[PDB]
Design a protein around this ligand. Structure first.
Ligand SMILES: C=C1[C@@H](O)C[C@H]2C(C)(C)C[C@H](Cl)C[C@]2(C)[C@H]1C[C@H](O)[C@H]1CC(=O)NC1=O
Ligand SMILES: [Mg+2]
Ligand SMILES: [Mg+2]
Ligand SMILES: [Mg+2]
Ligand SMILES: [Mg+2]
Ligand SMILES: [Mg+2]
Ligand SMILES: [Mg+2]
Ligand SMILES: [Mg+2]
Ligand SMILES: [Mg+2]
Ligand SMILES: [Mg+2]
Ligand SMILES: [Mg+2]
Ligand SMILES: [Mg+2]
Ligand SMILES: [Mg+2]
Ligand SMILES: [Mg+2]
Ligand SMILES: [Mg+2]
Ligand SMILES: [Mg+2]
Ligand SMILES: [Mg+2]
Ligand SMILES: [Mg+2]
Ligand SMILES: [Mg+2]
Ligand SMILES: [Mg+2]
Ligand SMILES: [Mg+2]
Ligand SMILES: [Mg+2]
Ligand SMILES: [Mg+2]
Ligand SMILES: [Mg+2]
Ligand SMILES: [Mg+2]
Ligand SMILES: [Mg+2]
Ligand SMILES: [Mg+2]
Ligand SMILES: [Mg+2]
Ligand SMILES: [Mg+2]
Ligand SMILES: [Mg+2]
Ligand SMILES: [Mg+2]
Ligand SMILES: [Mg+2]
Ligand SMILES: [Mg+2]
Ligand SMILES: [Mg+2]
Ligand SMILES: [Mg+2]
Ligand SMILES: [Mg+2]
Ligand SMILES: [Mg+2]
Ligand SMILES: [Mg+2]
Ligand SMILES: [Mg+2]
Ligand SMILES: [Mg+2]
Ligand SMILES: [Mg+2]
Ligand SMILES: [Mg+2]
Ligand SMILES: [Mg+2]
Ligand SMILES: [Mg+2]
Ligand SMILES: [Mg+2]
Ligand SMILES: [Mg+2]
Ligand SMILES: [Mg+2]
Ligand SMILES: [Mg+2]
Ligand SMILES: [Mg+2]
Ligand SMILES: [Mg+2]
Ligand SMILES: [Mg+2]
Ligand SMILES: [Mg+2]
Ligand SMILES: [Mg+2]
Ligand SMILES: [Mg+2]
Ligand SMILES: [Mg+2]
Ligand SMILES: [Mg+2]
Ligand SMILES: [Mg+2]
Ligand SMILES: [Mg+2]
Ligand SMILES: [Mg+2]
Ligand SMILES: [Mg+2]
Ligand SMILES: [Mg+2]
Ligand SMILES: [Mg+2]
Ligand SMILES: [Mg+2]
Ligand SMILES: [Mg+2]
Ligand SMILES: [Mg+2]
Ligand SMILES: [Mg+2]
Ligand SMILES: [Mg+2]
Ligand SMILES: [Mg+2]
Ligand SMILES: [Mg+2]
Ligand SMILES: [Mg+2]
Ligand SMILES: [Mg+2]
Ligand SMILES: [Mg+2]
Ligand SMILES: [Mg+2]
Ligand SMILES: [Mg+2]
Ligand SMILES: [Mg+2]
Ligand SMILES: [Mg+2]
Ligand SMILES: [Mg+2]
Ligand SMILES: [Mg+2]
Ligand SMILES: [Mg+2]
Ligand SMILES: [Mg+2]
Ligand SMILES: [Mg+2]
Ligand SMILES: [Mg+2]
Ligand SMILES: [Mg+2]
Ligand SMILES: [Mg+2]
Ligand SMILES: [Mg+2]
Ligand SMILES: [Mg+2]
Ligand SMILES: [Mg+2]
Ligand SMILES: [Mg+2]
Ligand SMILES: [Mg+2]
Ligand SMILES: [Mg+2]
Ligand SMILES: [Mg+2]
Ligand SMILES: [Mg+2]
Ligand SMILES: [Mg+2]
Ligand SMILES: [Mg+2]
Ligand SMILES: [Mg+2]
Ligand SMILES: [Mg+2]
Ligand SMILES: [Mg+2]
Ligand SMILES: [Mg+2]
Ligand SMILES: [Mg+2]
Ligand SMILES: [Mg+2]
Ligand SMILES: [Mg+2]
Ligand SMILES: [Mg+2]
Ligand SMILES: [Mg+2]
Ligand SMILES: [Mg+2]
Ligand SMILES: [Mg+2]
Ligand SMILES: [Mg+2]
Ligand SMILES: [Mg+2]
Ligand SMILES: [Mg+2]
Ligand SMILES: [Mg+2]
Ligand SMILES: [Mg+2]
Ligand SMILES: [Mg+2]
Ligand SMILES: [Mg+2]
Ligand SMILES: [Mg+2]
Ligand SMILES: [Mg+2]
Ligand SMILES: [Mg+2]
Ligand SMILES: [Mg+2]
Ligand SMILES: [Mg+2]
Ligand SMILES: [Mg+2]
Ligand SMILES: [Mg+2]
Ligand SMILES: [Mg+2]
Ligand SMILES: [Mg+2]
Ligand SMILES: [Mg+2]
Ligand SMILES: [Mg+2]
Ligand SMILES: [Mg+2]
Ligand SMILES: [Mg+2]
Ligand SMILES: [Mg+2]
Ligand SMILES: [Mg+2]
Ligand SMILES: [Mg+2]
Ligand SMILES: [Mg+2]
Ligand SMILES: [Mg+2]
Ligand SMILES: [Mg+2]
Ligand SMILES: [Mg+2]
Ligand SMILES: [Mg+2]
Ligand SMILES: [Mg+2]
Ligand SMILES: [Mg+2]
Ligand SMILES: [Mg+2]
Ligand SMILES: [Mg+2]
Ligand SMILES: [Mg+2]
Ligand SMILES: [Mg+2]
Ligand SMILES: [Mg+2]
Ligand SMILES: [Mg+2]
Ligand SMILES: [Mg+2]
Ligand SMILES: [Mg+2]
Ligand SMILES: [Mg+2]
Ligand SMILES: [Mg+2]
Ligand SMILES: [Mg+2]
Ligand SMILES: [Mg+2]
Ligand SMILES: [Mg+2]
Ligand SMILES: [Mg+2]
Ligand SMILES: [Mg+2]
Ligand SMILES: [Mg+2]
Ligand SMILES: [Mg+2]
Length: 252
RNA sequence: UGAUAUGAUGCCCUGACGAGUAGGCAGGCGUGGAGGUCAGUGACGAAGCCUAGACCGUAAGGUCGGGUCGAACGGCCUCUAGUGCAGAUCUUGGUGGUAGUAGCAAAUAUUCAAAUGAGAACUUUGAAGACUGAAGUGGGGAAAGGUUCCACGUCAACAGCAGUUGGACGUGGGUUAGUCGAUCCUAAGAGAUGGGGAAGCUCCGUUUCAAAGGCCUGAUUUUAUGCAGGCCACCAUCGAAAGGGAAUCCGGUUAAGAUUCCGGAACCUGGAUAUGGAUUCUUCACGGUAACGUAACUGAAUGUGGAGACGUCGGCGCGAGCCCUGGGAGGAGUUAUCUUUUCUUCUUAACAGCUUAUCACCCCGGAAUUGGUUUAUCCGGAGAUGGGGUCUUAUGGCUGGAAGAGGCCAGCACCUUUGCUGGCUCCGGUGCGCUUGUGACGGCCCGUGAAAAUCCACAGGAAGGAAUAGUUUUCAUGCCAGGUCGUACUGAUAACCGCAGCAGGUCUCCAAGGUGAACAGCCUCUAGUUGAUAGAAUAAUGUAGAUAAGGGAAGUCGGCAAAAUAGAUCCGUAACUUCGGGAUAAGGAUUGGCUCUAAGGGUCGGGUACGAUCAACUUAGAACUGGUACGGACAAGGGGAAUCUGACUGUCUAAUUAAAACAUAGCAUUGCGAUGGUCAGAAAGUGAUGUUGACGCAAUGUGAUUUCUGCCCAGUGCUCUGAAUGUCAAAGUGAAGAAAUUCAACCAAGCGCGGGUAAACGGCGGGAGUAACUAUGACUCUCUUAAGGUAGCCAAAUGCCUCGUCAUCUAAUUAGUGACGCGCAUGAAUGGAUUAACGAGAUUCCCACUGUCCCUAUCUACUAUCUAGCGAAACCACAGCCAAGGGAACGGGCUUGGCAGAAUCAGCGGGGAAAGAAGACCCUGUUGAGCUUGACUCUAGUUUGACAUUGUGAAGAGACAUAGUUUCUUUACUUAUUCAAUGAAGCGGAGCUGGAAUUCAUUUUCCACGUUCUAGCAUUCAAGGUCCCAUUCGGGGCUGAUCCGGGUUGAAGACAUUGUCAGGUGGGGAGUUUGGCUGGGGCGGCACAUCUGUUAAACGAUAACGCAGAUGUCCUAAGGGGGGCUCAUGGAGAACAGAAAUCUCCAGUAGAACAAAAGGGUAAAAGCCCCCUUGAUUUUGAUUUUCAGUGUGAAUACAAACCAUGAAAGUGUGGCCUAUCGAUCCUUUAGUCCCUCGGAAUUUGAGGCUAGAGGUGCCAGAAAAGUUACCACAGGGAUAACUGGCUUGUGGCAGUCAAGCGUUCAUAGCGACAUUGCUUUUUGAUUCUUCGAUGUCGGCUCUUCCUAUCAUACCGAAGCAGAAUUCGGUAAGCGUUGGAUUGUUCACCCACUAAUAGGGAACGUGAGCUGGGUUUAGACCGUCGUGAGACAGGUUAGUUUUACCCUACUGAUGAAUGUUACCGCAAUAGUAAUUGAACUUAGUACGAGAGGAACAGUUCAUUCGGAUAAUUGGUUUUUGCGGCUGUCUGAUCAG
C-alpha cells in the first residue's frame, strides 16, 4: 500500500512552514555581562503583529555596551507593556511587568513568560497567547527553581534561567468560534499546510490503516502502541485511557 | 556369368495380392553453393519472362517450338545446406470489389459591370446588398513560431470546387536606440567552497565547529607602489523580458523599420574642468516670533533616520481622456415640399519658468448657553470656534517649447520630380454621465496583507581653510563620452498546441451613439470584413425553428420534452423559526401616445423681507386620444402542501456516477516540556514541524444549532507510582571431562499474574408461571452473562414474512402520508432524537400550464434527392429466391419439391445466427496482480542485554580462606565523548575601600563593592594628570581603568552517543502459498488407501456420487500345545421361587458360539471348562493376490536354528479364512567390536555396514491463509447462465369402467377407486450447438400464425314453461378495449363492453425505440466477517455505436421479340366489412304469479375500409392587408 499522510510530512515538501511575512524569531537578549551582574535598559520602540502567531511581538532596542551603535531585539509582548516603556533586563532588576529577571531573583508566586530551559537559550517555555509559568519554589543550595508550566507539569530549572515578568498578550483568542471553513482556511494559510483533514476512514486501504470496508469504520482498536512502527501510528497513540473525561481535571 | 556386344542392383519364367487418418520406412522430383567430367551451350543471342502450340512421365516434373530479351548457363558422378508454402487475426510491398458511392449541409449573403488573362461563380477595380457592432471580424502585445513581413516573377504539387489569387513556388529586399527591454537587485528557490557521510556515481551543509576578504587615504619625491594608521567582518554565486529600477518627447519619413532614422526640442550617468555668482577681516551665508524661506552657503571616521515599500471593499471629493452641447469661421450632404438644417475641421508633447492643494503645522487668542463639523459622529484646557500665516506640488492655470508643426479651406500652375500663392485654425456651457487616476475618510480579520540593490538626509566634528587675499563645484554657464544582444510579422474559425488552413484549447491593455438599471439583448459611427464548393428542384425519412379545434397527464418508470410565469410601480402576504428569516411567499391592480399642473436647486451685491440671473431628469397629480392597445421586439422567477436525506457556502471520479459521497465550523478523545512528540534518510557535524513551545505542534473520531449521549473491561487492543520465584537469549559464573563438549544455577526486556480504560475495537439473552369470561401480564420462579438494548425512534434509504394491520388521499393506489410495534435484524459522537434555513439530491399529491396523450395535421430553413468538380472507409471463404427433410438437434449451397428472363433508381430495416474485441460472466491452468489477516517465510525500524569506546578518587559489599591485587553497587572528579551560546568580552583566584556583624585579642567571618520620575544625548586608542621627543605642526608612554592564572562561557559526563553480536517487538514493508473427484462450479459426501455380500450376465476380469454394510482398532490370551466336555431351543419334573434365580432327566445337524462388517468355515471342533506355556522368537531366499508380472500390505510351502506342548503321531513362524496400513534424506535405538577419518599412532568424537522406531490417511509419500464488484493472462463450447434439440416426472388439457352425486333417477349436469392418453406459453432432467461474442427482463410499434372458441352466424341436449343459463356440433370469417398501484411478466381493483378467450413466430420484435428492473466502476443502511470484503437483502446515481453492400419488402425506370399509336381481353395473385341499440312486433307468446321473448318492418349507432375539401375547423413566407416596439435613412413620403 501507499505511504500514508502522516509519513509524507517529514520530507517537508509542501508541509514546510509559511514563513515569508514573519517578523523574525522572538528571543531574549544574549546573556552577557550586563544581564548577569547588573541590569540593562531598553525602550519598546513598537509592538507588532507577527503572521501565523497568536500574540504580538514587541521590538525592544538597547545600546551595544562594547560598541557605539543600537541593537534591536524581538520580544514576545507581555500584556500591559507599551510603546515608549523602559525595559530592564538583568540579575539585579526591579520586579515589574515587562522586565526580564533570573528565576532565582523573584519570589514564589511570581508570574513570568518566555522562560528559558537552560540559562542562555533565549527562552523556550510559555510563549503562546495567554500562557505563563508560576514559580512554585526555590532550592538555593544547587540554586534551582521549581516552576509549573502551562500544561500543568512541574519542572525544575536553573535559577540563572531568565524569564520575563507578566503573562503573554492576546489571550482569550480561542474563546471565539471560527464559525466557518474560510476563517479556518485563512488561519492555516499563514501557518502550514495541515488543513483540511480527510478522515482515514473515508479512504481506501492503500491509503490508511482505517481505509476500506463496505461501511465506514476502524475495524480494530484505534489505540496504537509506542512500539508501533511508521505507517502503523494513526489514531490514538499510546493512550493510557480513552473515552469522555468525567469529573474534574487539574492535577493535584 | 559361357565367350565374340550394349544394363548381374541385370535378363527370362511363374503365382498371389492392391482401402487408409495419426504414424513408420522406401524409391524418386525440384533449388543456392562445392569437387570432378562432357576439351558441354552461347552476342550467328546465355539467363529470364509470355504463349486455351507440340512431346515424355502415374506423379513431383522434364523436353521443344514461337514471341520477348540481352551475358552469361547447363547434363552426368559426387559434396553441401539459411533447399520447395495457400493458410499461421503470418512479415513487407503491391492491388481489388465496395464506388464515381458515403459525402464536400454549424458560424444570416449575396449581386451587377469593367479590367486582366489561353481560361474568371472564386483575381483586381467600381457599384450595390449586408455583417462584425467597440465584452469587435477593430487597434496592439506576452508565451510559442521563425521569415510566415515587403517587392517582383509566377501555378507542377498544395489551399478535400476552381484559381490568373495565397501564409504556396522562384528570386531578392527588409529589423538602426546613452533614454524601450535585457543587462543590475533581490523572492520562493537553486547551488560552488573549509568540511562531515558514502565502496563509489555522489549525499549533506551555505555561514555551517574554517587562519575565509578590501576600501579609503596616507607614507614615495632611489619609484614605483613597499609599509604606516584607522576602519568593515558584510563570507560565493544563479534565480523576475508581469516584482524593485537613472534618464525622451512631438512632427515628418518606408514597398517593408521606427519612443531606434530625419528634424527640432530635452533629460540621465560617468569623466573632465574654467569663467561668472556666492562666501570670508565676526572665516565656513543671511532672513522670519514661529511654522519655515533661498541660486549658492566646506564636513572624514562612525552612527541614525527616510525613501525603495506594498491587503481588500465601501461611499464621498477632485483631475484627465471620452460623452453631451451654445455662438462663430470653413468644407460636405438633402432641398416637389419642410428643416437659420444633417455630417465634418477648429489641435498643442516631453521638458522649463511663475503659479496652483486636500491634509498637516505655526502665531495671536482662552471656550457651558458647549461649540465646530462629514453623505458617513468625530474633534477641543494635552488649547476648540475665530483672525492671521507656513508647508507638500498630485493637479490645474498663464507663458516659454510653438506655430515655423499639424488640421481644414480657396485660388492658380502641368507629361514630369510635382510645386506656388494665399487665407482661417476663434470664444464658451453642462454632469449621481462613462472609463481611468488620485485624495481625505470609513468597514473587515485567531488573514493585519515581500525582499534586496539603490538614492538622499540628519547626528557627529576628523580635518582643511582669508586680507594682500583664501575657501568653495549640492548655484549658473561651458567641454568630452555613453559599449554588447533583441527590435520584421502572426498572436489565432489559416503564422502557437491539438498528425491539418481541425466548430477544440491558449495570459492581457485601449472601448463611440440610441433604447435600457446596465460592459445585457437589439440597431448604428469609426475600423475590418463580406472568407466557409457551386447550380437546379423542394419526394419520403430526418436535423433545427414554429402553430394547432374540444379535452387537459387519460401519455410515461417518471410531466421526460414542451408550455405556462417573468420588468417596474402600487396593494397584499400563511405554517413555522435559531427572531436573522420564511418572502418576489401566496394573491391582486396598473403600464402607450399626446397635452398640461405641482414639488425638488446654483450663483452673486444687502447698514455695523425680498431682489437678479443661469443650468438639470426625477417624483406625483390632471386632462385629451386609440378596433382595450401599451415591460407591444428585445429582455424576463411558475407556484403550493408533504416524506426521505445532507446543516449551510464549498469539494471529487478530465472522457458513462456531482450524490445522501468528501470537506467544513462545532463536539470529543490521544501523544508530547526539547536529553521531547510525530515524521524523513544508506549514512552523516543530515532533515520536516521550527522565524515553533501546550491559547502549541502532531494523531484519530463525530459532524452547524437545540436536546440527549444509558449499561458492559469477560475478549481483542492500549495503558500502569503494581506483582514475583512461573517462563526466559548472547556474554558472564559453577561442576564434570584429557579436551572438544555435557549438566547446572544465576538472569534483561518480554510473556504469565494483578490494576486502569468504551467520544478504543466492539457487545448490550433464553425458558416457565401469574389479575373473579376471554385477552393481556404490572408480579413471581428458573437457566445463563462481561452486561443482558435505557432515553428515543420505526414496515423508516434499517422489517424476512410483505402488496403487514388500521386510517387517509382516489371511481379504483404493490404508490404517498398519519398511526400501530415480541422490531427476521431500530437505537444512542459505530452517535440517538429533534430541527429554522439551504439543495441541478430521492419520493407523494395539488393549482397553473400545456401536442405527453385521445390523434393527428400544417409551415420555415438545411439535408436527403438530380447535375459539375472533388472523392474516402468498414467489410469481403465462395456467394446471395424459398418450403420441407435430414444434418453439429434453426441451410445461400446438400435431398425432394416451389420455381426461374437483361440492365436498373429511391426507400427500407425481416434476414445475411451482419459489422465492431482471440467472452468482461462461468470453469480449467500446478498463470498473475491490487488488497487483508495470529497463513507460511522473512524484514527496515524499535526495544532490551553483553562486549568495545572507558579514564580518576572515596565510602559499601564480594575471594586466596580478618594483610590488598581484583570484581560489582552507591557518589564524587574532568580530560574522552555529548549539548547549548558568542563578530570566543569581562571567567577563576586574590586585593582595594565600605559596611551588616560581636569582638572573648584582633578580625573569626558573610554580604556587597558607578546605571530606575521623562519615547533626549553616550563614537575619533578619553578628557584629566604625569613623564618623554629636543620643542612645530605632530607624536609616544604611563595613569585614568588594582593584581595574578592565558580554562572563550556554560550544561552533560565514563552516563548518553556510536560500533558488534543477543533476546523481544515489528502486515509498516518483502516473498510465497492458499488439494482432488464432482451429471458446471460451490456447500455436502468420499465413490482418494481399503474389506464383505450383491450389482456381475454359472472360469477370470469388469463401471456409476449403484445397493446393504464394515476399516485407522481390539487381545499375554482372544497367541501356541494337550485333555475333557457339547451348543441355541423345547418338553417334563423339585420348599420359599413368581414370566425371569438354582437342581434333574429327555429331545436337540448346530436352529449357538468363534472381539468386530459380512460371507465362507467348524461338533470326541474351530465352540465351552481345565492343565502346561511364549513359535507373537532367530537367519536369509522362493512363491500367491494386487502387477509393469515394479513397490507396499497381506498370505503360502520349504530350508537352517532355538524352543513350546503331548504317551505319542504330530502341531505351533501370532489372532479359523477373506480388511486392519507407509519410500528416499534425516534423527534415534538394537547388532559385530567389524571397516574409515587418507603423513604415523593412542584415546575421545565422527563416519560406514545389518536390522528396527519417529510419517507421510491427497494413504507410490510438497512444507502452506483469505479477498477482489478495481481486477489481469492463456484457454475451454472437454464447462454453467440465454435461444433451439431429445425427454414429459412435474404442470396443463382430454378419455375409458361406472360405485356414487343429482327429492326419485349411474351417464341432464357431474363423478370416486382405478386406468389409457395428448400437449410443449410450466418447472425439471440432459449438456448436442454457440465462450477469436447469436446484445438481458418489460413495455411501446407492427405483421402473421395456432385453436384447447370469450364474443358474433347456423345448429343439436337439458333436471329447456317464459326470461336467463348450462352441455355439445360446424366454426379462427370477424373482433377481444379505457384506467388506479407495481420496472415488472404476473397479480389486483375501478369502469366500459357483443366479448374484454388462451397461445406461437430465436420465451416474435434494441444498426426499430425506450432504458424503469437486472448486472461493472460512486454511495447510504441492515445482516455477516478481526479485516480486505460478502449478501440469490433494502436504497440512489450511472455513454444504448455503423447500413452506402446482398437479399427480402415497398414503390420507380427499362434493352430486345419490324416501327409507332389507339382501344381491349384476363391467366395468375390479392380482396372486406364488422358489432350494438331503440321504435314496432308487445306488456304479446309462456306462466298461479313474479316476470317476460323472437322473426318481418323502421330509425340510428360501434369498430374497420376507400375517397373527398361544398361546408366548419387546424396550418401561414400569399411575408397579402393592417397594427406595434427599438434603431438606422436630416424631416416627409417610402423603407
Ligand atoms: C518434513 C519432514 C520433517 O519436518 C519431519 C520428518 C519426521 C516426521 C520427523 C520423520 C519423517 Cl520419516 C520425515 C519427516 C516427515 C520429514 C520429511 C521430509 O520431506 C524429508 C524426507 C526426505 O528424504 N527429505 C526431506 O526433506
Ligand atoms: Mg523554512
Ligand atoms: Mg491542503
Ligand atoms: Mg477530521
Ligand atoms: Mg474531516
Ligand atoms: Mg471511498
Ligand atoms: Mg494497510
Ligand atoms: Mg491494524
Ligand atoms: Mg476500514
Ligand atoms: Mg463510523
Ligand atoms: Mg520411380
Ligand atoms: Mg516435340
Ligand atoms: Mg533466350
Ligand atoms: Mg549489357
Ligand atoms: Mg547429391
Ligand atoms: Mg537467403
Ligand atoms: Mg528456410
Ligand atoms: Mg501447401
Ligand atoms: Mg502466399
Ligand atoms: Mg490464404
Ligand atoms: Mg497447409
Ligand atoms: Mg468524379
Ligand atoms: Mg453523392
Ligand atoms: Mg454531414
Ligand atoms: Mg463566392
Ligand atoms: Mg448589425
Ligand atoms: Mg455587447
Ligand atoms: Mg503585431
Ligand atoms: Mg495548375
Ligand atoms: Mg498550404
Ligand atoms: Mg483544390
Ligand atoms: Mg550591460
Ligand atoms: Mg550542495
Ligand atoms: Mg541575477
Ligand atoms: Mg526586470
Ligand atoms: Mg519590471
Ligand atoms: Mg528605411
Ligand atoms: Mg545669500
Ligand atoms: Mg512589491
Ligand atoms: Mg518624460
Ligand atoms: Mg503671522
Ligand atoms: Mg452625489
Ligand atoms: Mg494597515
Ligand atoms: Mg530624502
Ligand atoms: Mg552642477
Ligand atoms: Mg492570420
Ligand atoms: Mg483551430
Ligand atoms: Mg463625435
Ligand atoms: Mg466546409
Ligand atoms: Mg397564431
Ligand atoms: Mg389543443
Ligand atoms: Mg384547465
Ligand atoms: Mg419511478
Ligand atoms: Mg407536473
Ligand atoms: Mg424540463
Ligand atoms: Mg413557500
Ligand atoms: Mg394613461
Ligand atoms: Mg419516502
Ligand atoms: Mg450539501
Ligand atoms: Mg465521470
Ligand atoms: Mg452539484
Ligand atoms: Mg456527469
Ligand atoms: Mg559525523
Ligand atoms: Mg460527512
Ligand atoms: Mg437513562
Ligand atoms: Mg446493572
Ligand atoms: Mg472488555
Ligand atoms: Mg545462557
Ligand atoms: Mg465483544
Ligand atoms: Mg425503548
Ligand atoms: Mg399504501
Ligand atoms: Mg399516482
Ligand atoms: Mg419496526
Ligand atoms: Mg418472522
Ligand atoms: Mg455510548
Ligand atoms: Mg447501527
Ligand atoms: Mg433544533
Ligand atoms: Mg430540493
Ligand atoms: Mg441518402
Ligand atoms: Mg438535372
Ligand atoms: Mg472526407
Ligand atoms: Mg429454407
Ligand atoms: Mg420432403
Ligand atoms: Mg449462411
Ligand atoms: Mg413446395
Ligand atoms: Mg437486418
Ligand atoms: Mg454487413
Ligand atoms: Mg477466448
Ligand atoms: Mg492439474
Ligand atoms: Mg492491479
Ligand atoms: Mg490465523
Ligand atoms: Mg500481529
Ligand atoms: Mg563567549
Ligand atoms: Mg558508555
Ligand atoms: Mg509486519
Ligand atoms: Mg503481503
Ligand atoms: Mg496444500
Ligand atoms: Mg476441483
Ligand atoms: Mg475419475
Ligand atoms: Mg466438497
Ligand atoms: Mg488418489
Ligand atoms: Mg489402508
Ligand atoms: Mg465371474
Ligand atoms: Mg484386473
Ligand atoms: Mg451418494
Ligand atoms: Mg476328536
Ligand atoms: Mg510381533
Ligand atoms: Mg483395481
Ligand atoms: Mg516389470
Ligand atoms: Mg489391504
Ligand atoms: Mg518372520
Ligand atoms: Mg522368518
Ligand atoms: Mg483361537
Ligand atoms: Mg527422532
Ligand atoms: Mg550400537
Ligand atoms: Mg582416530
Ligand atoms: Mg588411508
Ligand atoms: Mg588427514
Ligand atoms: Mg496423492
Ligand atoms: Mg515406488
Ligand atoms: Mg496415490
Ligand atoms: Mg517437488
Ligand atoms: Mg460481486
Ligand atoms: Mg410436460
Ligand atoms: Mg406430462
Ligand atoms: Mg400430469
Ligand atoms: Mg367401479
Ligand atoms: Mg335420470
Ligand atoms: Mg401451462
Ligand atoms: Mg457441449
Ligand atoms: Mg444449454
Ligand atoms: Mg459464448
Ligand atoms: Mg462466433
Ligand atoms: Mg455480433
Ligand atoms: Mg442478430
Ligand atoms: Mg327429470
Ligand atoms: Mg350440431
Ligand atoms: Mg383470421
Ligand atoms: Mg408505475
Ligand atoms: Mg390486495
Ligand atoms: Mg417456446
Ligand atoms: Mg425475446
Ligand atoms: Mg441498440
Ligand atoms: Mg438503468
Ligand atoms: Mg439504480
Ligand atoms: Mg446524475
Ligand atoms: Mg454499409
Ligand atoms: Mg441510418
Ligand atoms: Mg310497450
Ligand atoms: Mg309455474
Ligand atoms: Mg373491426
Ligand atoms: Mg404631413
Amino acid at each position: 500500500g501507499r505511504v500514508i499522510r502522516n509519513q509524507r510530512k517529514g520530507a517537508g515538501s509542501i508541509f514546510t512552514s509559511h514563513t515569508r511575512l514573519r517578523q523574525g524569531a522572538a528571543k531574549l537578549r544574549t546573556l552577557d555581562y550586563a544581564e548577569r551582574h547588573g541590569y540593562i535598559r531598553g525602550i519598546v520602540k513598537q509592538i507588532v503583529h507577527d503572521s501565523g502567531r497568536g500574540a504580538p511581538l514587541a521590538k525592544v532596542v538597547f545600546r551595544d555596551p562594547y560598541k557605539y551603535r543600537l541593537r534591536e531585539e524581538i520580544f514576545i509582548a507581555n500584556e500591559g507593556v507599551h510603546t515608549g516603556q523602559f525595559i530592564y533586563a538583568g540579575k539585579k532588576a526591579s520586579l515589574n511587568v515587562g522586565n526580564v529577571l533570573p528565576l532565582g531573583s523573584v519570589p514564589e508566586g511570581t508570574i513570568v513568560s518566555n522562560v528559558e530551559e537552560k540559562p542562555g537559550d533565549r527562552g523556550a517555555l510559555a510563549r503562546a497567547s495567554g500562557n505563563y509559568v508560576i514559580i512554585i519554589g526555590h532550592n538555593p543550595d544547587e540554586n534551582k527553581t521549581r516552576v509549573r508550566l502551562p500544561s500543568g507539569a512541574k519542572k525544575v530549572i536553573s535559577s540563572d534561567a531568565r524569564g520575563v515578568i507578566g503573562v503573554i498578550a492576546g489571550g482569550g483568542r480561542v474563546d471565539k468560534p471560527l464559525l466557518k471553513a474560510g476563517r479556518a482556511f485563512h488561519k492555516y494559510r499563514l501557518k502550514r499546510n495541515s488543513w483540511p483533514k480527510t478522515r482515514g476512514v473515508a479512504m481506501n486501504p492503500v491509503d490508511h490503516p482505517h481505509g476500506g470496508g463496505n461501511h465506514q469504520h476502524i475495524g480494530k482498536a484505534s489505540t496504537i502502541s509506542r512500539g508501533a512502527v511508521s505507517g502503523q501510528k494513526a489514531g490514538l497513540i499510546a493512550a493510557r485511557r480513552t473515552g469522555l473525561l468525567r469529573g474534574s481535571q487539574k492535577t493535584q
